[PDB]
Amino acid sequence: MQAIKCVVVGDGAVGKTCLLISYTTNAFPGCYIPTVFDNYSANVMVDGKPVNLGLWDTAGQECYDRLRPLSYPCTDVFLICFSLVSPASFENVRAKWYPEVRHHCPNTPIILVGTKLDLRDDKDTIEKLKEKKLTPITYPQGLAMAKEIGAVKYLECSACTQRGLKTVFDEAIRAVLCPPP
Ligand SMILES: Nc1nc2c(ncn2[C@@H]2O[C@H](COP(=O)(O)OP(=O)(O)O)[C@@H](O)[C@H]2O)c(=O)[nH]1
Ligand SMILES: [Mg+2]
């Protein structure tokens, strides 16, 4: 029936691959590639609506700044990801990922995703940031960024515990099925 293309962007090490693997397949060996004959699209059904959600991961490296935008054509929604325990990835949304997604696709919906939510309350992770004079991204800080980039939604998730993870992909679909003109 309905086809929705979703592209995930954001810094290396923020959890983009793990977010996709954890949502589609659980377990370390699940780590799938598009070459898998089983399928690439996802079988999702919401409020009686049959949606085939195609998921695309991205090489976040500076080297592939020329090759990564080739997957941007015909994207219905973007997930812009930053790690909630990395302030550098957060400011890379401001300086790189939002300008890049907007330059190539001016009218496509953006969902801002705060990743690694489980590590925001982690005592060791918090101490290690504090040593470098850094702190985790709070819900007000992430919501503030979402407003600055005019994102359709701000969501926080963990791929590791699966907290809020399913909600991210459900909202990606709702951004396309219930837009604003
Ligand atoms: N605690 C924790 N670690 C995570 C989560 N997601 C990814 N990671 C870890 O973060 C690192 C980067 O993950 P990956 O998905 O490859 O990053 P990508 O470069 O953005 O794709 C790996 O060491 C993962 O195990 C998470 O939700 N919680
Ligand atoms: Mg990756």
Swiss-Prot record:
Residue numbers bearing the (Microbial infection) O-AMP-tyrosine modification: Y32
Family annotation (InterPro entries): P-loop_NTPase, Small_GTP-bd, Small_GTPase, Small_GTPase_Rho
Modified residues ((Microbial infection) O-AMP-threonine): T35
Entries under SUPFAM superfamilies matching the protein: P-loop containing nucleoside triphosphate hydrolases
EC number from the UniProt entry: 3.6.5.2
Enzyme class name: hydrolase
Free-text tissue specificity from the UniProt record: Isoform B is predominantly identified in skin and epithelial tissues from the intestinal tract. Its expression is elevated in colorectal tumors at various stages of neoplastic progression, as compared to their respective adjacent tissues.
Post-translational modification summary for this protein: GTP-bound active form is ubiquitinated at Lys-147 by HACE1, leading to its degradation by the proteasome.
Enzymatic reactions: GTP + H2O = GDP + phosphate + H(+)
Location of Phosphoserine modifications: S71
Annotated PROSITE patterns: RHO (PS51420)
Cross-link (Glycyl lysine isopeptide (Lys-Gly) (interchain with G-Cter in ubiquitin)): K147, K166
Membrane topology: Lipid-anchor
GO cellular component, one term: endoplasmic reticulum membrane
Phenotype upon changing K166R: Loss of FBXL19-induced polyubiquitination
Record keywords, A-Z: Cell membrane, Cell projection, Cytoplasm, Disease variant, Glycoprotein, GTP-binding, Hydrolase, Intellectual disability, Isopeptide bond, Lipoprotein, Membrane, Methylation, Nucleotide-binding, Nucleus, Palmitate, Phosphoprotein, Prenylation, Synapse, Ubl conjugation
Record bears the keyword Disulfide bond: no
Consequence when changing L67A: Strongly reduced interaction with PLCB2
An annotated Gene Ontology molecular function: GTP binding
Effect noted on mutating T17N: Constitutively inactivated. Abolishes interaction with PARD6 proteins. No effect on NR3C2 transcriptional activity. No interaction with PPP5C. Doesn't activate PPP5C phosphatase activity and translocate PPP5C to the plasma membrane
Domains: entry comment: The effector region mediates interaction with DEF6.
Role according to the record: Plasma membrane-associated small GTPase which cycles between active GTP-bound and inactive GDP-bound states. In its active state, binds to a variety of effector proteins to regulate cellular responses such as secretory processes, phagocytosis of apoptotic cells, epithelial cell polarization, neurons adhesion, migration and differentiation, and growth-factor induced formation of membrane ruffles. Rac1 p21/rho GDI heterodimer is the active component of the cytosolic factor sigma 1, which is involved in stimulation of the NADPH oxidase activity in macrophages.
Family indicated by similarity: Belongs to the small GTPase superfamily. Rho family.
Name the UniProt record assigns to this protein: Ras-related C3 botulinum toxin substrate 1
Organism per entry: Homo sapiens (Human)
Species classification: Eukaryota, Metazoa, Chordata, Craniata, Vertebrata
Gene of this entry: RAC1
